[PDB]
Every structure is written in C-alpha cells, then in structure tokens.
C-alpha cells in the first residue's frame, strides 16, 4: 500500500549508488572483476546497510563495487538506461541524477580511481554515455531525466573540470553542479578548486547545489550558501542548530533536498531525536524528498515517502506540496520548468 501513489519528483539520487545488484554481478562476471559476493542477496547484505554507522563507514561501500562498473563504456551507458527504468516504476516524473564523472574514467583522470589500468574512457566519455543512456531512457519509459556533475570534496583538483563539463553537457543532460564525498573533511567546502569552480558556476549561469549539513555543522550550510552560493543544499538538516542562519535561509525560500531513510542509516540524523524534516514541515520549509543511495539503503522512494508518513506525521497534502516544491526548485529552464508543474497539478486533482 504505497505511501504516495501520485506522480514525485526527485532532485537528490546517485546513479553510482542507484545501480541494480543484477547488474553488477553481470559485470564483475563478464569483466573478471572481483565482488564480495556471488549471489544477489549476499551482494546486497554486503553492499546495503540495513543500520547506522557513518559518513565515511557509509563511503567504504562503494569500494566493493565501483570498480566493476568504471571505465566499461557498456557498464555505464547500462547503468544510466537502468536508472530511468527504475524510476519510472516509482511514480517519478521528473528527476535529476548526480555522479562524479571522474570516478567512473580510466583514462586522463588522477589519481587514477579505483587502481584502475590507464584505458580509453575519459571523464568526458563518462558524461557522454551516461547522457546516451539517460535519453535512451527518457524514450523508453516516458519520463524526464537530468543529471548533475558532482565535485568531489577531497579532491578540488578535479572541479574546475566538472565546471567545464557541466557547460560542454548544458542541460544536454546536465543541468547543475553539486559538490558530493566526506563531509567529515575539515573546511574542505573552501578548497580554493571547489571555490574556483562554484564562482565560475555563478559567472557563467551554471546551476549549483552542494551537500552541507549531512553530518556536518552549521559552518559547512553557510559556507556552501554564502562562498558557494549555492541554489539548493544537499539534506541540510544540521542548518537548524544555527537559529539564525536556520530562518534567514527560510526567509530566503532555500531548498532542502532531504533523504530522510539515508539519514537514519548514515547516522547524518540521530534516531534519538526528532528528525530535522519535522521542523522544515512545520516551517512550511521548501524541501524534497529523496533515496539518496538506494542500492546501498536497500531502499525506493516509498521506503523515505512511508517513514515520513508513519513516523513524522505526513499527509497526502505535504507530500502535494513538497513536490510542487521539487518542481519550482528544480534546475529546468522556465518552459519546462512550467510544463512539470501543468502535469502536477492535473495528476493532482
Ligand atoms: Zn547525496
């Protein structure tokens, strides 16, 4: 019994933690590429969480399965096409899928991810065949599909690159910019490539979004709102120990992509207390909800749509809202932007 049975739209998922356990076994089989486990289900008992640990116990899981999937053009083009597949069963319209293209190449990309061997896709290709993916996808299933290029906060040598390709790919698929990895990282959001990249964002039009406040303090919003200038931050749920800071970015209508299920198991939100989407509910904040990483969450939107309603008191008309809310702070241009919100509110009625 679905939490939302209406049409959703998803500002807040990964496609390199939104891939199939059928589909990385296939890879790691057909490219001879070592997984922790030869079943599906023991994939997923490795991979997933099913509790909290941390932000960087959280990031290690990737390292199980990461490197059957970079640098295999099929893989990524795959994985994209997958993607929109996925979300179209879940009643999502619209949505904007994020990834560090760098740490799916093999080739002109250092360091070199995952001890790969020197190959032939670039992290231009990667974009290149995510997108071929993504709009075979859009066709296929008959929803819309952006994505975003995601800095990474330990690595601001590689940003300037994503501003380029972010520009290269402008909403052909790529729509915005995020600054995505450890958070943990002291100060990491003002890593002069990270602020280089984010400034040229702005000169150039180019949309941004940066995760802050995940597990990080107050400081780290701030930091990504008012250096970064940031459009939308990433969960943002540590905003409010900041009153002030907290209802300044009220006043200024900031979104919140909120991933309330990946809160609980990355340990981003402490299960002892209420959650900070109750606050940003009872604020009529403007905010989404999102998977995150649902191949390690073992999770689908109904998983985060459920909780907010068994659990935080979520009603059928601020799942409505927050939605709508998705819609207008979405990075689609104006027409589009209008075509989402015509479609909701004919869904809606
Ligand atoms: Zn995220």
């Given at each position: 019994?679905?939490?939302?049975?209406?049409?959703?739209v998803?500002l807040?998922?990964?496609?390199?933690?939104?891939?199939?356990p059928?589909?990385?076994?296939?890879?790691?089989k057909?490219?001879?590429?070592?997984?922790?486990?030869?079943t599906?289900?023991?994939?997923r008992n490795?991979?997933?969480?099913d509790?909290?640990?941390?932000?960087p116990?959280?990031?290690?899981?990737?390292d199980?399965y990461?490197?059957?999937i970079?640098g295999?053009?099929e893989?990524?083009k795959?994985?994209?096409?997958?993607?929109?597949?996925?979300?179209?069963?879940?009643?999502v319209?619209?949505?904007?899928?994020?990834?560090?293209?760098?740490?799916?190449?093999?080739?002109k990309v250092?360091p070199?991810?995952?001890?790969?061997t020197?190959?032939?896709?670039?992290?231009?290709?990667?974009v290149?065949l995510?997108?071929?993916?993504?709009?075979?996808?859009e066709?296929?299933?008959?929803?819309?599909?952006?994505?975003?290029?995601?800095?990474?906060?330990?690595?601001?040598?590689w940003?300037?690159?994503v501003?380029?390709?972010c520009?290269?790919?402008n909403?052909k698929?790529?729509?915005?910019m995020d600054?995505?990895?450890?958070?943990?990282?002291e100060?990491?959001?003002?890593?002069?490539?990270?602020?280089?990249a984010?400034?040229?964002?702005?000169?150039?039009?180019?949309?941004?979004?940066?995760?802050?406040?995940?597990?990080?303090?107050?400081e780290?919003?701030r930091?990504?709102?008012?250096?970064?200038k940031?459009?939308?931050?990433?969960?943002?749920?540590?905003?409010?120990?900041?009153?002030?800071?907290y209802?300044?970015l009220?006043?200024?209508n900031?979104?919140?992509?909120?991933?309330?299920?990946?809160?609980?198991?990355?340990?981003?939100?402490?299960?002892?207390?209420?959650?900070?989407?109750?606050?940003?509910?009872?604020?009529?904040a403007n905010?989404?909800?999102?998977?995150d990483?649902?191949?390690?969450?073992?999770?689908?939107?109904?998983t985060?749509?459920?909780?907010?309603?068994?659990?935080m008191?979520?009603?059928?008309?601020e799942?409505?809202?927050?939605?709508i809310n998705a819609?207008?702070?979405?990075?689609?241009?104006e027409?589009?932007?209008?075509?989402?919100?015509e479609?909701?509110?004919?869904?809606?009625?």
């Amino acid at each position: 019994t679905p939490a939302f049975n209406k049409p959703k739209v998803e500002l807040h998922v990964h496609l390199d933690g939104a891939i199939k356990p059928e589909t990385i076994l296939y890879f790691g089989k057909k490219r001879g590429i070592a997984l922790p486990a030869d079943t599906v289900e023991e994939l997923r008992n490795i991979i997933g969480m099913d509790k909290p640990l941390s932000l960087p116990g959280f990031l290690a899981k990737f390292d199980y399965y990461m490197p059957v999937i970079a640098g295999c053009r099929e893989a990524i083009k795959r994985i994209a096409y997958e993607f929109v597949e996925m979300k179209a069963k879940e009643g999502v319209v619209y949505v904007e899928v994020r990834y560090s293209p760098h740490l799916l190449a093999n080739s002109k990309v250092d360091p070199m991810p995952w001890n790969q061997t020197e190959g032939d896709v670039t992290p231009d290709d990667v974009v290149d065949l995510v997108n071929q993916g993504l709009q075979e996808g859009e066709q296929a299933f008959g929803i819309k599909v952006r994505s975003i290029l995601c800095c990474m906060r330990h690595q601001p040598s590689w940003s300037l690159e994503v501003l380029e390709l972010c520009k290269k790919y402008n909403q052909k698929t790529v729509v915005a910019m995020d600054l995505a990895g450890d958070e943990t990282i002291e100060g990491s959001s003002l890593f002069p490539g990270h602020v280089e990249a984010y400034e040229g964002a702005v000169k150039n039009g180019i949309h941004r979004t940066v995760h802050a406040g995940e597990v990080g303090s107050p400081e780290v919003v701030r930091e990504a709102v008012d250096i970064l200038k940031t459009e939308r931050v990433g969960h943002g749920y540590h905003t409010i120990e900041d009153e002030a800071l907290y209802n300044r970015l009220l006043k200024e209508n900031m979104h919140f992509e909120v991933c309330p299920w990946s809160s609980y198991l990355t340990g981003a939100w402490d299960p002892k207390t209420t959650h900070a989407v109750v606050r940003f509910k009872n604020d009529k904040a403007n905010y989404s909800l999102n998977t995150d990483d649902p191949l390690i969450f073992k999770s689908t939107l109904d998983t985060d749509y459920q909780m907010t309603k068994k659990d935080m008191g979520f009603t059928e008309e601020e799942f409505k809202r927050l939605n709508i809310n998705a819609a207008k702070s979405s990075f689609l241009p104006e027409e589009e932007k209008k075509e989402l919100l015509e479609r909701l509110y004919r869904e809606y009625q």
